[PDB]
């Protein structure tokens, strides 16, 4: 509707309660109060839908090097893997199947 | 200009200065443009000469530079038309009948 009442009672029609409590405090909150500009422990929400890139393997090495097994994985990959990129993408099972036929002969 | 009514004894002080500012810097736009052209600035305006007499071309080059500035200065007659038309309306309204 376009006829909500008098001008004095205009701020009255805004509140909508989720409970059955009476009387109802009329004031409708506009924003959330932010008294102290505190640095949030939460991670940034910009890191939302970024595709795979260099930061993924760079951080993988940093977290893998925190383990003994991960240190062996990183060293063997960066030295003994003929790839022109660290952004490994599996689009076929050629390297997998040929590694099994060369292994199961025993 | 309403927010400057109490900033001075003249309500249109900023407008009276701005029309002069607008005139001076617009008048300087063609002057700086010819400076950017260089010594060849006349060839940018009129093009290639036609007669071998440098004195003859000088008169055609003087008119080419004259027209260069007339294209700008003559447009201020449009501003006079707006002020004259704006004043005529103010004169009719301010003298309209009320008894």
């Amino acid at each position: 509707t376009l006829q909500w009442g008098s001008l004095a009672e205009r701020p009255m029609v805004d509140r909508v309660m989720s409970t059955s409590t009476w009387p109802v405090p009329y004031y409708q909150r506009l924003f959330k109060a932010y008294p102290i500009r505190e640095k949030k422990d939460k991670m940034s929400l910009l890191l939302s839908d970024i595709d795979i890139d260099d930061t993924n393997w760079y951080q993988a090495k940093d977290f893998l090097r925190g383990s003994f097994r991960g240190r062996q994985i990183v060293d063997y990959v960066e030295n003994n893997i003929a790839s022109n990129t660290y952004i490994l993408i599996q689009q076929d099972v050629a390297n997998m199947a040929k590694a099994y036929v060369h292994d199961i002969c025993g | 200009h309403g927010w400057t009514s109490m900033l001075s004894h003249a309500v249109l002080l900023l407008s009276c200065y701005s029309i002069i500012i607008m005139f001076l810097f617009i008048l300087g736009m063609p002057t700086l443009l010819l400076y950017d052209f260089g010594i060849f600035f006349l060839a940018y305006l009129k093009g290639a000469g036609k007669y071998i007499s440098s004195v003859a071309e000088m008169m055609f080059d003087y008119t080419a530079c004259l027209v260069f500035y007339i294209r700008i200065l003559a447009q201020w007659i449009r501003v006079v038309l707006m002020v004259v038309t704006f004043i005529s309306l103010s004169h009719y309204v301010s003298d309209f009948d009320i008894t």
């Binding site: 795979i52 952004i87 993408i89 | 063609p30 940018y44 294209r71 700008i72 447009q75 449009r78 707006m82």
Partner: protein, 49 residues
């Protein structure tokens, strides 16, 4: 009408008659880098990004 005719002549038409932009270029390395860069990211596009 005089307002539009003022700025459409003092600036727009005046500078259209005495200034211009060239169409010839002196360097074209962005075009050939984008082609090589696209082949570098061929596998990622194949995954539908």
């Amino acid at each position: 009408s005089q307002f539009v005719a003022f700025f459409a002549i003092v600036f727009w038409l005046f500078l259209f008659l005495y200034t211009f932009f060239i169409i010839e270029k002196h360097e074209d390395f962005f075009s050939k880098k984008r082609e090589e860069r696209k082949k570098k990211l061929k596998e990622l596009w194949n995954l539908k990004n």
